[PDB]
Subunit: 311 residues, 3 copies
């Protein structure tokens, strides 16, 4: 039958390596759900529900035609059951029924990855919106049979909207707020679970001259992202994460429960800012990340300020 | 004047008219009636709907690019206001709205040429436009390419809409339209085909394992943009924004307000597949949830049941 | 080096002429920021922050491979500094750092236009959302080296959402409302800065038989547009302002901080209404424009009302 291979899965913002196999395999993935309290912002704590200890879950990377076998464990300290719906999976609930797992239990199931693409996976236990809004989502990349083109740098980015009882900035442990969630009025909108998770000392890094690809998911639960990198243009966009390629795009829509792949070349050093360009989200609710690029200046691409005079 | 005349075959949702087996233009005659009527929105919740032909959405029309569409548009004498129709398929003043303004008890006729293929919203455009749309007056007209569309085993007609009631969702009785919530874009219900449960439970769509499925998806709005997804399926093909461009291997696709999309997939194994707007509180808290029930033989090679349950 | 050329820029809804040049140039652009009070609607005044005296800024048109040299002046009557982030620019802030300009000063800098497309530019001084929400955005078109196809008529259209302390209709000078902006609850949604800016006596004009191209931007700050022209179908859409072309589209998404190009032939006379088809925006918040087309009727394309009888 098919050979068995253990999956390499990565914590955001890292991405598993490209697959060098030209035949189908049974790829074994282990996942654990963990409820834990973490910092959403300075002085603000939140009780996240997570795949494997953070938001988003770890990235999976398989090849079209693979069978994906999932061993799904719910930590005994969890208060509720959890499960997983893979948008990459064809069949009931994307796997949700087969993976329904009470605290302190393990479920196993498998599915065939019939189509390439970049797929959200998320918990689907009722009330589904709360399980997602507490942070239970990630991406699985299903490569085309021939692979994707080579790039220098790859990053794993997932946007989410969060609903707290207090206003943004209100200190302490902030509970989930169902009324704000139903009204689609989030207090925080973030990349990778937390304000500053990929900014500042957590900034992404590259060098001038390098090609960059970002695997961008939107776990929602509710918002649609107008995704943009300040100071860059997307040379290529895989539209809605599908096969169709657009070029020379400044800002691209990432549907709720959907994805996009964007590619660009960083030509000169600087700090490049990832945003949701519904711009009060970025500068007032947290939807802001950084890519720091080192290397040599090149005035032919962009200069510093050349003069300052009276007007 | 010398074209043959064909009576249109139109369908109530979720059904779709047969494919056109024509490689030549015709004059297609369409009859429409507008009716105001109280129906159930949800358990114990009633709503005064304004409708094309007695339900939400209106009946689906299907013609071929290059056809002349002759519309006979009647407003039921019981209606309280005039109604008309703007076809996004039509080129010219108001998409036909200027030519179809019809008082209760009257009938208007006009015609237009369907110059471009696509999947087009049609809706009432009487002032105030947002209320006429928000009360349910929208449908789809499919204009086929001259060579037709590929064959598929099953076709469905789905239209999302957002609704604005004075009471909160669940509040019992006849709920009036709430202008202030509509202007704020804060709907109480978000539904497929006009009502909670319209294509779920006993009303679920039906297919058999092995069949290819095409869904004609509209968004009448008035206000929301849909992130459309089928739980347990991947879109093999998407006609982007309802146009000529085809995307493939898409999990969730944007349906603009007043816009559309065509999606296609193959249902490989049995199960209950859920249509949602994946702005997910709309799906599970406001009604934007449909079901496709597929019967046939299991296939563990596509997906298994739970294989084991052990202590962790 | 490069020949130096002065830019021809235009106030909306006009577009600069097509570029016939077959060689790269250094294109000099002068921009001034001005804060001024203008009418938003009948009896409603608003303190706008503008590029060159209105909303949107003047449209810039250059050729892929040009160097764009910007002379950026901030009027001494301004209360705060202003700058510009060009989405067409590759590098720090899209130029925002290099163009940071206090009231009464002029900055200069330059950047190379590396990719064709239709790009938003906007102010990026903190708080970014407020500078954008007060009116500081425009479009720059970067033509492909071979130019775009010829059309008869071209228009410059930019949607924006505005946040006033009072409800829509409230008279007098209306201050910016930060709370409504953070909540994404605008009072006005308009084309080109004001209610009626391209309607009525300000309507766009064409003649039956002409091909029309609209360069459509969305300055936001927050809303995504479902752009539609009542009575027309888009023959061509440059998706998200990029290279990919869709055809036969009734309504297209314009991302926040993004753009689209749409093209259609006007076949018969009439009044064709530009709307955001999130339709309460168009008929209750101001997102309504008009294209008046003169010429001969053609009943084979659409008839008038042919009869009115009893039912
Ligand atoms: Cu869960
Ligand atoms: Cu999902
Ligand atoms: Cu009506
Ligand atoms: Cu419409
Ligand atoms: Cu400014
Ligand atoms: Cu920007």
């Amino acid at each position: 039958e098919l050979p068995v291979i253990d999956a390499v899965t990565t914590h955001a913002p890292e991405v598993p390596p490209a697959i060098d196999r030209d035949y189908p395999a049974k790829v074994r993935v282990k996942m654990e759900t963990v409820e834990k309290t973490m910092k959403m912002d300075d002085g603000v704590e939140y009780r996240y529900w997570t795949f494997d200890g953070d938001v988003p879950g770890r990235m999976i990377r398989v090849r079209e035609g693979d069978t994906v076998e999932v061993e799904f464990s719910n930590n005994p300290s969890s208060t509720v059951p959890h499960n997983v719906d893979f948008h990459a999976a064809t069949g009931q609930g994307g796997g949700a029924a087969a993976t329904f797992t009470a605290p302190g239990r393990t479920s196993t199931f498998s599915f065939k990855a019939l189509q390439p693409g970049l797929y959200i996976y998320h918990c689907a236990v009722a009330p589904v919106g709360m399980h997602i809004a507490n942070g239970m989502y990630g991406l699985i990349l299903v490569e085309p049979k021939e692979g994707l083109p080579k790039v220098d740098k790859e990053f794993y980015i997932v946007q989410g909207d969060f609903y707290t009882k207090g206003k943004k900035g209100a200190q302490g442990l902030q509970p989930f707020d169902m009324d704000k969630a139903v009204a689609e009025q989030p207090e925080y909108v973030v990349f990778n679970g937390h304000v500053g998770a990929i900014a500042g000392d957590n900034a992404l890094k590259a060098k001038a001259g390098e090609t960059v690809r970002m695997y961008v998911g939107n776990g929602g639960p509710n918002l649609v992202s107008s995704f943009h990198v300040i100071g860059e243009i997307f040379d290529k966009v895989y539209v809605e994460g599908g096969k169709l390629i657009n070029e020379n795009v400044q800002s691209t829509i990432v549907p709720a429960g959907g994805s996009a792949i964007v590619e660009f070349k960083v030509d000169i050093p600087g700090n490049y800012t990832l945003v949701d360009h519904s711009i009060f989200r970025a500068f007032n609710k947290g939807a802001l990340g950084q890519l720091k690029v080192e290397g040599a200046e090149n005035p032919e691409i962009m200069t510093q300020k050349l003069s300052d005079t009276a007007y």
